[PDB]
């Protein structure tokens, strides 16, 4: 089972955590809970922004221009990236833009965080036909002492 996880600003703008103008410890914890003990797949740029692997997981970096890092697994195609994850229940795809696009037709589950924040951005989360997806979980939270904006956790399962 292939699942995507993403934080969406208004108009489905996506970016790197350290470049997005918000502070959302509840989202970090949401992210941690849903990716724990699962293999993760990410692109070149996401790998470079994240600085180190997510611990206790297998980290697969999908890139044409492979790197040398000894802690992750370097693949060059979508098929190769799925195989390198092995026979697990759920694979977590974490970005960035192109890699979301590539893994969507193969995806059966989405974890979205809808953040109420207007951010400038060139990259947007792939358009996904809402007829093909069903909401099974939604939870809205106001901004509070620690969280800079209101936000909505959503889980979508295909069909």
């Amino acid at each position: 089972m292939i699942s995507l996880i993403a934080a969406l600003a208004v108009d489905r703008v996506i970016g790197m955590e350290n470049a997005m103008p918000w502070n959302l410890p509840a989202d970090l914890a949401w992210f941690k809970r849903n990716t724990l003990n699962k293999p993760v797949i990410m692109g070149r740029h996401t790998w470079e922004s994240i600085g180190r692997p997510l611990p206790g997981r297998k980290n697969i970096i999908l890139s044409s221009q492979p790197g040398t890092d000894d802690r992750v697994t370097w693949v060059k195609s979508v098929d190769e990236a799925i195989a390198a994850c092995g026979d697990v229940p759920e694979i977590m795809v974490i970005g960035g833009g192109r890699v979301y696009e590539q893994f969507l037709p193969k995806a059966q589950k989405l974890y979205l965080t809808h953040i109420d924040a207007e951010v400038e951005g060139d990259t947007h989360f792939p358009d996904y036909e809402p007829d093909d997806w069903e909401s099974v979980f939604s939870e809205f939270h106001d901004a509070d002492a620690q969280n800079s904006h209101s936000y909505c956790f959503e889980i979508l399962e295909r069909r």
């Epitope: 955590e17 470049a19 502070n23």
Partner: nanobody, 117 residues
Framework: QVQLQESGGGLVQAGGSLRLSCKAS????????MTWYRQAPGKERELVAL???????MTVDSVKGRFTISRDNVQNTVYLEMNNLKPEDTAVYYC???????????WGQGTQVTVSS
């Protein structure tokens, strides 16, 4: 070690100005989102302001127009310029740095701000 060190705190009267700084050591400062928090005794720490790696800022409503956050990557320092201070701003202010989803995140030891009136 201690990666982050705040300074600039102290006592001022209402309506006065103050400039806080947080100097980072031993880290690649430019790759961190920086945030200022504050905590009054017993009360929980609350977000004050953040600045991204590409200089996007956000300040919370209670300090809008009074506080300003900036960073100087060359000096490994983030700043909180505070103007028109009010007694309700009295707190220990804490600098925080975060790399991204996998961390690491660092906290300073904090600096006391007391406003009189």
């Amino acid at each position: 070690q201690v990666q982050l060190q705040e300074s600039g705190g102290g006592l001022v009267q209402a309506g006065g100005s103050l400039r806080l700084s947080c100097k980072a050591s031993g880290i690649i400062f430019s790759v961190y989102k920086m945030t200022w928090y504050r905590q009054a005794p017993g009360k929980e720490r609350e977000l004050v302001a953040l600045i991204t790696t590409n200089n996007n800022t956000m300040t919370v409503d209670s300090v809008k127009g009074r506080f300003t956050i900036s960073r100087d990557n060359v000096q490994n320092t983030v700043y909180l310029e505070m103007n028109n201070l009010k007694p309700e701003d009295t707190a220990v202010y804490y600098c925080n740095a975060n790399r991204g989803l996998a961390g690491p995140a660092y906290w300073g030891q904090g600096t006391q701000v007391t406003v009189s009136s």
